[PDB]
Design an enzyme around this catalytic site. Structure first.
Site, mmCIF file in Angstrom:
data_model
loop_
_atom_site.group_PDB
_atom_site.id
_atom_site.type_symbol
_atom_site.label_atom_id
_atom_site.label_comp_id
_atom_site.label_asym_id
_atom_site.label_seq_id
_atom_site.Cartn_x
_atom_site.Cartn_y
_atom_site.Cartn_z
ATOM 1 N N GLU A 159 0.741 -1.264 0.000
ATOM 2 C CA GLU A 159 0.000 0.000 0.000
ATOM 3 C C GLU A 159 0.773 1.319 0.000
ATOM 4 O O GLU A 159 0.390 2.260 0.696
ATOM 5 C CB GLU A 159 -0.960 -0.018 1.192
ATOM 6 C CG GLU A 159 -1.800 -1.289 1.251
ATOM 7 C CD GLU A 159 -2.606 -1.432 2.531
ATOM 8 O OE1 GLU A 159 -2.526 -0.557 3.422
ATOM 9 O OE2 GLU A 159 -3.330 -2.440 2.645
ATOM 10 N N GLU A 184 -6.266 -10.854 -1.070
ATOM 11 C CA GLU A 184 -7.007 -10.754 0.185
ATOM 12 C C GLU A 184 -8.501 -10.639 -0.084
ATOM 13 O O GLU A 184 -9.198 -9.849 0.547
ATOM 14 C CB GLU A 184 -6.518 -9.518 0.951
ATOM 15 C CG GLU A 184 -4.981 -9.444 1.064
ATOM 16 C CD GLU A 184 -4.480 -8.267 1.890
ATOM 17 O OE1 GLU A 184 -5.284 -7.650 2.616
ATOM 18 O OE2 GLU A 184 -3.261 -7.969 1.831
HETATM 19 O O1 LIG Z 1 -6.444 -8.853 11.878
HETATM 20 C C1 LIG Z 1 -6.331 -7.726 11.021
HETATM 21 C C2 LIG Z 1 -5.846 -8.179 9.642
HETATM 22 O O2 LIG Z 1 -6.831 -8.995 9.029
HETATM 23 C C3 LIG Z 1 -5.583 -6.963 8.760
HETATM 24 O O3 LIG Z 1 -5.083 -7.376 7.533
HETATM 25 C C4 LIG Z 1 -4.910 -6.328 6.563
HETATM 26 C C5 LIG Z 1 -6.227 -6.037 5.851
HETATM 27 O O4 LIG Z 1 -6.044 -4.925 4.954
HETATM 28 C C6 LIG Z 1 -5.069 -5.183 3.927
HETATM 29 O O5 LIG Z 1 -4.954 -4.032 3.172
HETATM 30 C C7 LIG Z 1 -3.700 -5.549 4.546
HETATM 31 O O6 LIG Z 1 -2.767 -5.896 3.527
HETATM 32 C C8 LIG Z 1 -3.874 -6.721 5.519
HETATM 33 O O7 LIG Z 1 -2.639 -7.023 6.149
HETATM 34 O O8 LIG Z 1 -4.623 -6.089 9.377
HETATM 35 C C9 LIG Z 1 -5.087 -5.567 10.644
HETATM 36 C C10 LIG Z 1 -5.347 -6.716 11.629
HETATM 37 O O9 LIG Z 1 -5.884 -6.196 12.838
#
Ligand SMILES: O[C@@H]1[C@@H](O)[C@H](O[C@@H]2CO[C@@H](O)[C@H](O)[C@H]2O)OC[C@H]1O
Ligand code: NA
Length: 330
Positions: A133, A240
Protein backbone atom coordinates in the site's frame (compact mmCIF):
# COMPACT_ATOMS: atom_id res chain seq x y z
CA UNK A 1 -19.39 -31.89 2.73
CA UNK A 2 -18.69 -35.47 1.73
CA UNK A 3 -19.79 -34.82 -1.85
CA UNK A 4 -18.77 -31.14 -1.89
CA UNK A 5 -16.31 -30.05 -4.60
CA UNK A 6 -12.84 -29.00 -3.38
CA UNK A 7 -11.96 -25.40 -4.28
CA UNK A 8 -8.30 -26.08 -5.08
CA UNK A 9 -9.29 -29.04 -7.28
CA UNK A 10 -12.02 -27.18 -9.16
CA UNK A 11 -9.48 -24.49 -10.01
CA UNK A 12 -6.50 -26.84 -10.39
CA UNK A 13 -5.86 -25.67 -13.96
CA UNK A 14 -6.54 -22.00 -13.28
CA UNK A 15 -4.89 -20.80 -10.08
CA UNK A 16 -4.07 -21.71 -6.51
CA UNK A 17 -6.76 -21.09 -3.90
CA UNK A 18 -5.56 -19.64 -0.62
CA UNK A 19 -6.64 -18.48 2.80
CA UNK A 20 -5.27 -16.03 5.36
CA UNK A 21 -4.79 -17.66 8.78
CA UNK A 22 -3.21 -17.45 12.23
CA UNK A 23 -2.39 -20.27 14.69
CA UNK A 24 -5.85 -19.96 16.28
CA UNK A 25 -7.86 -20.09 13.04
CA UNK A 26 -5.77 -22.97 11.70
CA UNK A 27 -7.11 -25.02 14.60
CA UNK A 28 -10.65 -23.65 14.40
CA UNK A 29 -10.97 -23.99 10.61
CA UNK A 30 -8.50 -26.82 10.09
CA UNK A 31 -10.73 -29.18 8.10
CA UNK A 32 -11.95 -26.45 5.73
CA UNK A 33 -8.36 -25.46 5.02
CA UNK A 34 -7.25 -29.06 4.50
CA UNK A 35 -10.17 -29.79 2.16
CA UNK A 36 -10.05 -26.62 0.05
CA UNK A 37 -6.81 -24.65 -0.15
CA UNK A 38 -3.33 -25.11 -1.57
CA UNK A 39 -1.94 -21.74 -0.43
CA UNK A 40 -1.69 -19.98 2.92
CA UNK A 41 -0.93 -16.41 4.00
CA UNK A 42 -0.28 -15.24 7.57
CA UNK A 43 -3.04 -12.75 8.35
CA UNK A 44 -0.81 -10.90 10.81
CA UNK A 45 2.11 -12.95 12.06
CA UNK A 46 4.60 -12.18 9.31
CA UNK A 47 4.14 -8.42 9.54
CA UNK A 48 7.02 -6.38 10.95
CA UNK A 49 5.59 -5.88 14.46
CA UNK A 50 5.02 -9.62 14.84
CA UNK A 51 8.48 -10.62 13.59
CA UNK A 52 10.85 -8.01 15.07
CA UNK A 53 8.93 -6.24 17.89
CA UNK A 54 12.18 -4.84 19.30
CA UNK A 55 15.44 -4.34 17.41
CA UNK A 56 17.38 -7.59 17.40
CA UNK A 57 14.48 -9.45 18.96
CA UNK A 58 12.94 -11.81 16.41
CA UNK A 59 9.78 -13.71 17.29
CA UNK A 60 9.28 -16.30 14.55
CA UNK A 61 7.25 -18.75 16.67
CA UNK A 62 3.78 -17.97 15.30
CA UNK A 63 5.01 -17.64 11.70
CA UNK A 64 6.88 -20.94 12.08
CA UNK A 65 3.65 -22.67 13.13
CA UNK A 66 1.80 -21.31 10.11
CA UNK A 67 4.57 -22.44 7.76
CA UNK A 68 4.75 -25.86 9.43
CA UNK A 69 1.01 -26.32 8.90
CA UNK A 70 1.22 -25.31 5.24
CA UNK A 71 4.22 -27.50 4.46
CA UNK A 72 2.72 -30.54 6.21
CA UNK A 73 -0.29 -30.28 3.88
CA UNK A 74 1.62 -29.46 0.69
CA UNK A 75 0.25 -25.90 0.66
CA UNK A 76 2.20 -22.96 -0.76
CA UNK A 77 2.82 -19.89 1.37
CA UNK A 78 2.68 -16.20 0.45
CA UNK A 79 4.83 -14.01 2.70
CA UNK A 80 3.00 -10.91 3.97
CA UNK A 81 4.46 -8.32 4.38
CA UNK A 82 7.89 -6.64 4.65
CA UNK A 83 7.61 -2.86 4.19
CA UNK A 84 4.30 -1.19 5.08
CA UNK A 85 3.16 2.07 6.70
CA UNK A 86 1.08 0.04 9.18
CA UNK A 87 1.93 -2.52 11.87
CA UNK A 88 5.60 -1.50 12.06
CA UNK A 89 7.08 -0.70 15.53
CA UNK A 90 8.17 2.84 16.37
CA UNK A 91 11.73 1.71 17.18
CA UNK A 92 12.35 1.16 13.47
CA UNK A 93 12.31 4.88 12.68
CA UNK A 94 13.91 6.26 15.86
CA UNK A 95 17.39 6.59 17.36
CA UNK A 96 18.41 6.47 21.01
CA UNK A 97 17.16 10.02 21.56
CA UNK A 98 13.77 9.23 20.04
CA UNK A 99 14.59 11.27 16.94
CA UNK A 100 14.12 9.98 13.39
CA UNK A 101 17.08 8.03 12.04
CA UNK A 102 18.95 8.87 8.84
CA UNK A 103 18.34 7.44 5.38
CA UNK A 104 21.36 5.13 5.62
CA UNK A 105 20.44 3.85 9.08
CA UNK A 106 16.86 3.07 8.08
CA UNK A 107 18.13 1.32 4.96
CA UNK A 108 20.45 -0.78 7.13
CA UNK A 109 17.51 -1.74 9.35
CA UNK A 110 15.28 -2.47 6.34
CA UNK A 111 17.98 -4.68 4.82
CA UNK A 112 18.59 -6.52 8.09
CA UNK A 113 14.90 -7.23 8.64
CA UNK A 114 14.30 -8.33 5.05
CA UNK A 115 17.45 -10.46 4.94
CA UNK A 116 16.77 -12.21 8.26
CA UNK A 117 13.09 -12.85 7.57
CA UNK A 118 13.37 -13.89 3.92
CA UNK A 119 16.38 -16.15 4.45
CA UNK A 120 14.63 -18.02 7.26
CA UNK A 121 11.78 -19.12 5.01
CA UNK A 122 13.73 -19.46 1.77
CA UNK A 123 12.62 -22.66 0.04
CA UNK A 124 9.30 -22.74 1.90
CA UNK A 125 7.75 -19.39 0.94
CA UNK A 126 7.55 -18.82 -2.82
CA UNK A 127 6.53 -15.16 -2.93
CA UNK A 128 6.56 -12.03 -0.79
CA UNK A 129 4.47 -8.88 -0.61
CA UNK A 130 7.57 -6.67 -0.37
CA UNK A 131 5.85 -3.30 -0.50
CA UNK A 132 2.31 -2.94 0.80
CA UNK A 133 0.00 0.00 0.00
CA UNK A 134 2.62 2.64 -0.85
CA UNK A 135 0.27 4.35 -3.33
CA UNK A 136 -2.02 7.12 -2.05
CA UNK A 137 -5.65 6.08 -1.65
CA UNK A 138 -6.86 9.67 -1.96
CA UNK A 139 -5.71 12.98 -3.41
CA UNK A 140 -3.63 13.75 -6.49
CA UNK A 141 -0.33 12.54 -5.05
CA UNK A 142 1.16 9.31 -6.35
CA UNK A 143 2.44 8.11 -2.98
CA UNK A 144 0.96 7.87 0.49
CA UNK A 145 2.90 9.49 3.34
CA UNK A 146 4.91 7.12 5.55
CA UNK A 147 7.98 7.16 7.77
CA UNK A 148 9.73 4.83 5.32
CA UNK A 149 9.27 7.32 2.49
CA UNK A 150 9.92 10.37 4.67
CA UNK A 151 13.27 9.16 6.01
CA UNK A 152 14.69 7.27 3.03
CA UNK A 153 13.15 9.12 0.10
CA UNK A 154 10.94 7.93 -2.76
CA UNK A 155 13.45 5.25 -3.79
CA UNK A 156 12.68 3.28 -0.63
CA UNK A 157 10.63 0.82 -2.68
CA UNK A 158 13.45 0.18 -5.17
CA UNK A 159 15.72 -0.63 -2.24
CA UNK A 160 13.22 -2.95 -0.56
CA UNK A 161 12.78 -5.00 -3.73
CA UNK A 162 16.53 -5.20 -4.32
CA UNK A 163 17.17 -6.36 -0.73
CA UNK A 164 14.44 -9.00 -0.98
CA UNK A 165 15.79 -10.24 -4.33
CA UNK A 166 19.27 -10.60 -2.86
CA UNK A 167 17.90 -12.54 0.12
CA UNK A 168 16.01 -14.97 -2.15
CA UNK A 169 16.42 -14.47 -5.93
CA UNK A 170 14.02 -17.37 -6.60
CA UNK A 171 11.07 -15.75 -4.82
CA UNK A 172 8.38 -13.83 -6.70
CA UNK A 173 8.30 -10.29 -5.31
CA UNK A 174 5.03 -8.36 -5.18
CA UNK A 175 3.71 -4.82 -4.80
CA UNK A 176 0.35 -5.39 -2.99
CA UNK A 177 -2.53 -2.88 -2.67
CA UNK A 178 -6.30 -2.35 -2.25
CA UNK A 179 -8.91 -0.32 -4.22
CA UNK A 180 -6.73 -1.54 -7.07
CA UNK A 181 -9.58 -1.40 -9.61
CA UNK A 182 -10.77 2.19 -9.16
CA UNK A 183 -9.41 3.96 -12.30
CA UNK A 184 -7.54 6.78 -10.57
CA UNK A 185 -5.65 4.50 -8.19
CA UNK A 186 -5.21 1.80 -10.85
CA UNK A 187 -3.31 4.31 -12.96
CA UNK A 188 -1.09 5.28 -10.02
CA UNK A 189 -0.28 1.63 -9.29
CA UNK A 190 0.34 0.99 -12.99
CA UNK A 191 2.60 4.04 -13.26
CA UNK A 192 4.54 3.09 -10.14
CA UNK A 193 5.17 -0.53 -11.12
CA UNK A 194 5.97 0.43 -14.72
CA UNK A 195 8.56 2.93 -13.45
CA UNK A 196 10.19 0.29 -11.25
CA UNK A 197 10.20 -2.30 -14.04
CA UNK A 198 11.65 0.30 -16.41
CA UNK A 199 14.59 0.65 -14.02
CA UNK A 200 15.14 -3.10 -13.90
CA UNK A 201 13.84 -3.42 -10.33
CA UNK A 202 12.98 -7.03 -9.38
CA UNK A 203 9.23 -6.64 -8.99
CA UNK A 204 7.62 -9.78 -10.44
CA UNK A 205 3.98 -9.31 -9.60
CA UNK A 206 1.11 -7.15 -8.50
CA UNK A 207 -1.11 -8.25 -5.67
CA UNK A 208 -4.72 -7.16 -6.03
CA UNK A 209 -6.12 -7.26 -2.49
CA UNK A 210 -9.73 -7.31 -3.65
CA UNK A 211 -11.38 -6.12 -0.44
CA UNK A 212 -14.56 -5.63 -2.41
CA UNK A 213 -18.24 -4.90 -1.85
CA UNK A 214 -21.35 -6.21 -3.57
CA UNK A 215 -21.30 -3.21 -5.93
CA UNK A 216 -17.70 -1.96 -6.11
CA UNK A 217 -15.60 -2.28 -8.17
CA UNK A 218 -17.73 -3.05 -11.23
CA UNK A 219 -16.95 -6.10 -13.36
CA UNK A 220 -15.72 -3.82 -16.16
CA UNK A 221 -13.37 -2.06 -13.71
CA UNK A 222 -12.03 -5.42 -12.58
CA UNK A 223 -11.48 -6.52 -16.18
CA UNK A 224 -9.79 -3.21 -17.02
CA UNK A 225 -7.45 -3.44 -14.03
CA UNK A 226 -6.46 -7.05 -14.77
CA UNK A 227 -5.66 -6.12 -18.37
CA UNK A 228 -3.85 -2.92 -17.38
CA UNK A 229 -1.63 -4.68 -14.85
CA UNK A 230 -1.14 -7.75 -17.06
CA UNK A 231 0.13 -5.48 -19.85
CA UNK A 232 3.18 -4.80 -17.67
CA UNK A 233 4.27 -8.42 -18.01
CA UNK A 234 3.91 -9.15 -14.30
CA UNK A 235 2.20 -12.08 -12.61
CA UNK A 236 -1.10 -11.35 -10.88
CA UNK A 237 -2.32 -12.66 -7.54
CA UNK A 238 -5.73 -11.83 -6.04
CA UNK A 239 -4.41 -11.65 -2.46
CA UNK A 240 -7.01 -10.75 0.19
CA UNK A 241 -10.37 -11.41 -1.41
CA UNK A 242 -13.61 -10.87 0.49
CA UNK A 243 -17.02 -9.53 -0.51
CA UNK A 244 -18.42 -7.29 2.18
CA UNK A 245 -22.16 -7.13 2.75
CA UNK A 246 -21.74 -3.38 3.39
CA UNK A 247 -20.80 -0.61 0.95
CA UNK A 248 -18.34 2.04 2.18
CA UNK A 249 -21.15 4.47 3.07
CA UNK A 250 -23.00 1.78 5.03
CA UNK A 251 -21.84 1.91 8.64
CA UNK A 252 -24.85 0.17 10.22
CA UNK A 253 -24.21 -1.94 13.33
CA UNK A 254 -27.70 -3.36 13.94
CA UNK A 255 -27.82 -6.20 11.39
CA UNK A 256 -27.71 -9.50 13.23
CA UNK A 257 -27.83 -11.40 9.95
CA UNK A 258 -27.58 -10.71 6.20
CA UNK A 259 -30.85 -10.39 4.29
CA UNK A 260 -31.91 -12.99 1.74
CA UNK A 261 -31.23 -10.33 -0.90
CA UNK A 262 -27.69 -9.75 0.37
CA UNK A 263 -26.93 -13.48 0.36
CA UNK A 264 -28.34 -13.79 -3.17
CA UNK A 265 -26.47 -10.78 -4.55
CA UNK A 266 -23.29 -12.03 -2.87
CA UNK A 267 -23.75 -15.39 -4.60
CA UNK A 268 -24.18 -13.65 -7.96
CA UNK A 269 -21.23 -11.36 -7.22
CA UNK A 270 -18.88 -14.25 -6.42
CA UNK A 271 -19.98 -16.15 -9.52
CA UNK A 272 -19.33 -13.12 -11.73
CA UNK A 273 -15.94 -12.48 -10.14
CA UNK A 274 -14.72 -16.05 -10.48
CA UNK A 275 -16.00 -16.25 -14.05
CA UNK A 276 -13.80 -13.24 -14.77
CA UNK A 277 -10.79 -14.71 -12.94
CA UNK A 278 -11.11 -17.96 -14.88
CA UNK A 279 -11.28 -15.97 -18.12
CA UNK A 280 -7.93 -14.44 -17.17
CA UNK A 281 -6.39 -17.70 -15.96
CA UNK A 282 -3.36 -17.07 -18.18
CA UNK A 283 -2.25 -14.12 -16.02
CA UNK A 284 -3.83 -14.79 -12.61
CA UNK A 285 -1.91 -17.52 -10.80
CA UNK A 286 -3.39 -17.42 -7.31
CA UNK A 287 -6.59 -16.32 -5.58
CA UNK A 288 -6.42 -15.98 -1.80
CA UNK A 289 -9.40 -15.07 0.40
CA UNK A 290 -8.70 -13.04 3.55
CA UNK A 291 -9.99 -15.92 5.65
CA UNK A 292 -12.17 -18.90 4.72
CA UNK A 293 -15.41 -18.98 6.75
CA UNK A 294 -17.66 -16.30 8.23
CA UNK A 295 -16.79 -17.26 11.82
CA UNK A 296 -13.57 -15.26 11.34
CA UNK A 297 -13.14 -12.08 9.31
CA UNK A 298 -11.38 -8.79 9.91
CA UNK A 299 -14.48 -7.14 8.45
CA UNK A 300 -16.32 -7.72 11.73
CA UNK A 301 -14.32 -4.81 13.16
CA UNK A 302 -13.27 -2.86 10.07
CA UNK A 303 -14.22 -0.26 9.05
CA UNK A 304 -16.85 -0.42 11.81
CA UNK A 305 -15.76 -1.89 15.12
CA UNK A 306 -18.03 -4.34 16.91
CA UNK A 307 -20.38 -5.51 14.17
CA UNK A 308 -20.66 -8.66 12.05
CA UNK A 309 -20.00 -9.31 8.37
CA UNK A 310 -20.48 -12.42 6.20
CA UNK A 311 -17.87 -12.00 3.41
CA UNK A 312 -16.73 -15.52 2.52
CA UNK A 313 -17.84 -18.74 0.78
CA UNK A 314 -18.59 -20.71 3.96
CA UNK A 315 -20.80 -19.69 6.89
CA UNK A 316 -20.09 -19.64 10.63
CA UNK A 317 -20.91 -23.35 10.86
CA UNK A 318 -18.41 -23.95 8.05
CA UNK A 319 -21.18 -24.91 5.62
CA UNK A 320 -21.18 -23.77 1.97
CA UNK A 321 -23.18 -20.62 1.28
CA UNK A 322 -25.01 -19.92 -2.00
CA UNK A 323 -21.86 -18.04 -3.09
CA UNK A 324 -19.87 -21.29 -2.89
CA UNK A 325 -22.01 -22.99 -5.53
CA UNK A 326 -21.83 -20.15 -8.04
CA UNK A 327 -18.08 -19.69 -7.52
CA UNK A 328 -17.22 -23.34 -8.22
CA UNK A 329 -19.54 -23.73 -11.20
CA UNK A 330 -17.93 -21.18 -13.52
O1 LIG B 1 -6.44 -8.85 11.88
C1 LIG B 1 -6.33 -7.73 11.02
C2 LIG B 1 -5.85 -8.18 9.64
O2 LIG B 1 -6.83 -8.99 9.03
C3 LIG B 1 -5.58 -6.96 8.76
O3 LIG B 1 -5.08 -7.38 7.53
C4 LIG B 1 -4.91 -6.33 6.56
C5 LIG B 1 -6.23 -6.04 5.85
O4 LIG B 1 -6.04 -4.92 4.95
C6 LIG B 1 -5.07 -5.18 3.93
O5 LIG B 1 -4.95 -4.03 3.17
C7 LIG B 1 -3.70 -5.55 4.55
O6 LIG B 1 -2.77 -5.90 3.53
C8 LIG B 1 -3.87 -6.72 5.52
O7 LIG B 1 -2.64 -7.02 6.15
O8 LIG B 1 -4.62 -6.09 9.38
C9 LIG B 1 -5.09 -5.57 10.64
C10 LIG B 1 -5.35 -6.72 11.63
O9 LIG B 1 -5.88 -6.20 12.84
NA1 NA C 1 -3.39 -19.26 -13.97
Amino acid sequence: NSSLPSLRDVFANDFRIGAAVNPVTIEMQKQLLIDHVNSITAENHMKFEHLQPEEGKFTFQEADRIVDFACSHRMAVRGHTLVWHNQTPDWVFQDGQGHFVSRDVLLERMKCHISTVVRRYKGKIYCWDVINEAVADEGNELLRPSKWRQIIGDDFMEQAFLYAYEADPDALLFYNDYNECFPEKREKIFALVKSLRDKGIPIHGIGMQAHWSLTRPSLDEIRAAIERYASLGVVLHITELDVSMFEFHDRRTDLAAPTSEMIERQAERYGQIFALFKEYRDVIQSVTFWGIADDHTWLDNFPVHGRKNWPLLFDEQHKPKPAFWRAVSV
